[PDB]
Symmetry: D2
Subunit: 417 residues, 4 copies
Amino acid sequence: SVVGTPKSAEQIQQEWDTNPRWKDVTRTYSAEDVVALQGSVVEEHTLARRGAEVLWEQLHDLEWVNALGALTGNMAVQQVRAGLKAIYLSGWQVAGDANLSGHTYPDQSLYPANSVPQVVRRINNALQRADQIAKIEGDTSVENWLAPIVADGEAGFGGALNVYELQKALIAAGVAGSHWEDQLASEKKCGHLGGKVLIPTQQHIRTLTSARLAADVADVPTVVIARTDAEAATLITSDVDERDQPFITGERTREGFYRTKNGIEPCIARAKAYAPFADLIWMETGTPDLEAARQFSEAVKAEYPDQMLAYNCSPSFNWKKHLDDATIAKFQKELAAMGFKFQFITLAGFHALNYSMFDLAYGYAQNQMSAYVELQEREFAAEERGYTATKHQREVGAGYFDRIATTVDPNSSTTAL
Amino acid sequence: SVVGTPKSAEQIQQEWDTNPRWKDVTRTYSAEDVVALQGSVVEEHTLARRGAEVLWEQLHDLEWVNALGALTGNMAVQQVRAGLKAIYLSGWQVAGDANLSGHTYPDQSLYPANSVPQVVRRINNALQRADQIAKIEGDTSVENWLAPIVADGEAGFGGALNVYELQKALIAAGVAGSHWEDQLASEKKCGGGKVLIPTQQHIRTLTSARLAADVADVPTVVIARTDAEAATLITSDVDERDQPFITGERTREGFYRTKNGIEPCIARAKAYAPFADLIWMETGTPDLEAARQFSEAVKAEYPDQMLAYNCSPSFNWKKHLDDATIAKFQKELAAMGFKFQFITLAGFHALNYSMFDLAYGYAQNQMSAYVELQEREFAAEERGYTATKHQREVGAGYFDRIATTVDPNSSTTAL
Amino acid sequence: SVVGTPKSAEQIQQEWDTNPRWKDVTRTYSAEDVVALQGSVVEEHTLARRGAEVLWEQLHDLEWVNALGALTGNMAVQQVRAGLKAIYLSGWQVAGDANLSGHTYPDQSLYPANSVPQVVRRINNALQRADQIAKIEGDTSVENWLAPIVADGEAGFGGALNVYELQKALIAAGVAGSHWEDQLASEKKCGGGKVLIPTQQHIRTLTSARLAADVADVPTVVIARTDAEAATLITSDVDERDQPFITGERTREGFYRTKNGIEPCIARAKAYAPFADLIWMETGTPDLEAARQFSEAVKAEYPDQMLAYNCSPSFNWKKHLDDATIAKFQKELAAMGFKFQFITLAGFHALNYSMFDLAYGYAQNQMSAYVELQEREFAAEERGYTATKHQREVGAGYFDRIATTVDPNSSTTAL
Amino acid sequence: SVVGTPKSAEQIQQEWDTNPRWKDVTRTYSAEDVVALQGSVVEEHTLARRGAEVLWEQLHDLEWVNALGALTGNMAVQQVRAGLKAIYLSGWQVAGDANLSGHTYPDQSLYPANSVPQVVRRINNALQRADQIAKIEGDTSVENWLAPIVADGEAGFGGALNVYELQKALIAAGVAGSHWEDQLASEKKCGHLGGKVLIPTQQHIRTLTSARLAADVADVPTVVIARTDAEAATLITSDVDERDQPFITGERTREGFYRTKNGIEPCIARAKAYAPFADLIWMETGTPDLEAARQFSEAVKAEYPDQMLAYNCSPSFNWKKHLDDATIAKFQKELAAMGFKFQFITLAGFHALNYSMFDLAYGYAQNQMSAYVELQEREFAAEERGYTATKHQREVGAGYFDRIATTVDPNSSTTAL
Ligand SMILES: C=C(CC(=O)O)C(=O)O
Ligand SMILES: C=C(CC(=O)O)C(=O)O
Ligand SMILES: [Mg+2]
Ligand SMILES: [Mg+2]
Ligand SMILES: [Mg+2]
Ligand SMILES: [Mg+2]
């Protein structure tokens, strides 16, 4: 058998040289380095490849791509049924309510490192079932059930090899893109002079290089997002990288961390340093602020006018205390005009799930079935916008499995499609 | 070490004889049979014991115990924060969106048999974190975070040993009660209907589940479910109790056609009563008259037998009922002896609907839709909702306190 | 994007019609039935396809394909390093020491149904790491590290849909072949014997497994196993092919007593042949005459039908056979058409014995026992053993090369 | 219900004050700090408590406790049947052939952090089945099937909270003791001036404190082992701790690591610093050397004469090239005389499994059944020393489950025990 024969270094190099996908993508390693790590057989990763291709297309065709955080398969199925074209997989949400430890965790890289890959695979499985059901029912209402997944890679749960293995695991599960941040969450100092701890610029370039190499060895054009936490971070592990030295204050704490001046300047500097190694750049920010977004946007594009940006819209910001309805209403459109082509709400699923269950359960504790009928009536109404989960058996594939059982029975006949 | 030394057959026997918990509980096996299966060390199962005890207490003190299906830890945390005293763990919901295969399945015992135990363990982990947070914050608003969990056991994923291992795994995870049904879902004929198993086989199932609870040394609550209302087929006519409803026709698989309805459900419920702490007649449409007839027929032989009731999540409740009937439904049922009531698919509907509504709003208006949800969350704070404070909701202050305890240059707040 | 576009019903049909792989393969369903179950995108399964292709090739080129049971990744790596061309994945061994419950189980389909797929995936991961290491080291001593895997499918853990999902999960993990048996282990009567299912039900199982392979678009090798040599009971007399052996007596569970032996195994094998790439008569004692009689009876109707043979790990081989018979056993069987042969429990015995012998030596003499094992490992290097270089065996040089690739101040060795 | 009611701070403090177990055990946190983290209900951890108690007993009664690395449940069952009184759970072996990623990994904290806890739970399950079988068969030949498990905790997969969560997960699975090392494996530099990277002394005291606190909050007297990697390590993350400064050379690498003088001196210094926080101390060493063992032994006991030590006997050292048979034969007895009360071979299971399968498979590839009969004959012979796995069905519990099935059947009767 010749199934899965690797490409040659020449073919790979030629694709890096000629495919517009790799315009302005720096790989400090060689095509031979990639082939040297592939063994004799390269597994195809169908969903990871299709998702990365679809995601790149969409980022260049649509006015922007927006997404909500999904932590279960059904959540993602509903996001797609409602008309979204991408799925965001929050590591925060996974820590909170969907990781392999079984525990509720805060957002400090506490959960087992293969947790997000498992949820990626779950989400793709759920979308695949929605697509199977759609096909056997002649449902053409959704063009692409297999929406690309953008997954939270945290800072990789360790060093370069941890980064590599996480990216490989995300790719195997069918991820379309992954984001990677330049902090050490496990040493977040929670005292009064504490805060987030950055790692040196060169180390995050190491992380982004590792992630790209895992994609190359897996032979898929995964979308790579660099996140910088330098807006708020007050500490950094080391001053060894001279690009970081302009912000070093000269103080070192009792734990050995270096105090560093934070804000938009180091975020601009780090984004420029990361741009050659990142398909998109993301400045984590506490306050939604169109002006600060524009300033970061323009500083980065002054050196890299084609560099695409990513934007998280803060779920904890008190939006309506601080912005009027019109600013809220135009926020994403403005950001998209500035180059933020991927935008998302990290904790959408957490809030929807916790709120809907609290509201239903509170009603239920006081009035039993009357609360449930309020929810059921809203579901019935929602049928008008395309909601289908009111037909619960069919939603989870009962018709699909009946068809399988009928296919297998030689005395029952299947309906022609 | 003496940790975990088993009891004697004598102590076990005396507890079966004198503890009011075991009035009306038949064990066809012996206390020696139990001790023989325990080895040299018996692991303590704190959460399974405490949950089963609280569940029994509540079933005898409150007017009724009700619950909503939970498929995530946060879901159960919110149900308890909102004032519920029990959690229902739907295997249907687990098939749909929370099982170890990673796949979306319909309700036919397709998922790996240890999936529900994992979700039990997750739910307990989440309630324990809520309890930890409440303690360090002086929050007394909820008196018992560790609400008892009642879990779906399907028909055990096989034979008596499969039942035994599932009950053992549910107990290990900290389950308080488990329900067990008398159908073979993996042979549901689809041309058809559900296929029952003989009455004696389900008595075997209930005996297996009680034996696993005994060997684990916890007073787990056992719920027997009968699917005889709707089931049209049965695997065999070997049981004389099943023969009155056998028509005599056999399908191409060898299954026997059987008259379904409330009559075989009353018969099977009476057969199951000695082996079940609660009895549940699965029904498709909510029907107070059918519930009353089943209740009364069963209590005519076992006036103390407690019953359980699923309130249909798919029934178009209102299309068919006025607001007052809907509002009194559970109270009427409770008066009939239905002391555990639940909505199996509450979580599935809350999750799917809330995400569809948010996502549709978002696709059309971006941040304005999220702001609608956020404002509703703010409003809900007035009723005790706390998840707007998201970091604290998932334990950020708790883990900060651990970090402060471990740091010798920081001092911990005294409680 | 066009990635993963399904084939047409027409292409599938033509491949079933013209590819020699599907000579003598009956599909009672249609190509349209297959396309209807594929959705819009078909995931490629590289390892399942390559393994199934290599396995079919080898079964037609070599005198016979033999294998040992592997329950860990390293076990399979050593089997291939030693020169074997296939891996056997024992579900018995998985029950005993490698299943997702964490428990030690006997051989009664007690473990979670996705456990064997996980071990398939693990074994492939381990072979892939060995292949990676060999490449960066210029090691050509092994031509194919990715030996095809044949996995135990039990009886599917339920009905047709359970079979379907198990085959799908085995393919997803990269399995090359899977075997499926016609008993209900979860009802093994223990007073007793194995309980068969009707012939038509196992044809349903094999059809389910072929359908799952088709929908996944891989030419998985399907092995049908019959337990009719020893089984004394059967669930139903509904199948006319089973009736000649029914005695007419029924047990208290409703099972029918049936004459066991080679005769019902020949009958069932002939019934299964159109739906099976290989046929396997489970047998307790190795018996060349019984193997010859079964082989010849089956090939009288299907002269091209390939057979599979488990060589008993519990038989006291030698107490009963001279050295020359033992030495020729597999070659004789191969001459009879047994083209896949294996020892189910090779790994269980190698693991348990090597650890008992080492640990006993250690308990009595501490380091001297370990030094005995280490010296034997050194000696084995002469035959190609490499695990004495332990860091390199588990990938230390490979991950060093990744670290060197990622570091822009270090240069990588050219291959 | 009152099941699982927590103890008061007073009871806890009184046990720390009066129980000889806690003689010379420093806790820098308070009993109130412990109670503050326990919520309203404390789960009992039966096997973790019994294993920690049995392990402490054995460490004080026997001349020493020795162990072999086990990576499957059957391996541990065989170690106990052969007469060992403890089980060692190698994280190396778990990386190599038994972790939740499914992948073969080298020993660099690459696998998901809950992997060892899963194997602990597996090993206890396997021993529990052996004990059940023994009881129903009247097998009294083994006194304690539930041998204590000592598990590899690596350096905790991150910071203090990662350490805490791993220790809690090990305790929940029934671990008896856990060991913790002072290196950052994920930044091991593999170049020519590379090597292992130490963390500051104060940080490892933080790790050991965290591990003790997780045990206290879980209410079990888990055995805590500190390992130092300073014999060979050439780098350290920071020079901020003045106890480390004597060995700092003054050079810092391009990655920001500090070059540090290695050997037995920093191992003695670190062991002394760790002793108040560790039930046993372990100097990782490359060469088995009774003299170096004695020197480390005596330096530590000069300040802490009662401090127990732990010793790994190197599986890669070429024992018979470098030591005569008599030294090999007396090695553990000598070490025990010097205070090494827990001794183990980390990779015993890896070598036994890989070698036995290679030997069998090589024989099999050339001669089919003749190779298997050689193995079977050795098993038959081994029956004489108590080996039972030749009876394969009974070994994995077939008799136990037949008894369960017979217990459940009201028309079959059980055998009286
Ligand atoms: C809440 C989050 C989650 C995260 O850190 O990924 C944010 O606002 O970015
Ligand atoms: C091989 C090992 C494994 C380990 O690092 O724990 C050693 O010798 O210590
Ligand atoms: Mg995160
Ligand atoms: Mg169900
Ligand atoms: Mg088997
Ligand atoms: Mg290790």
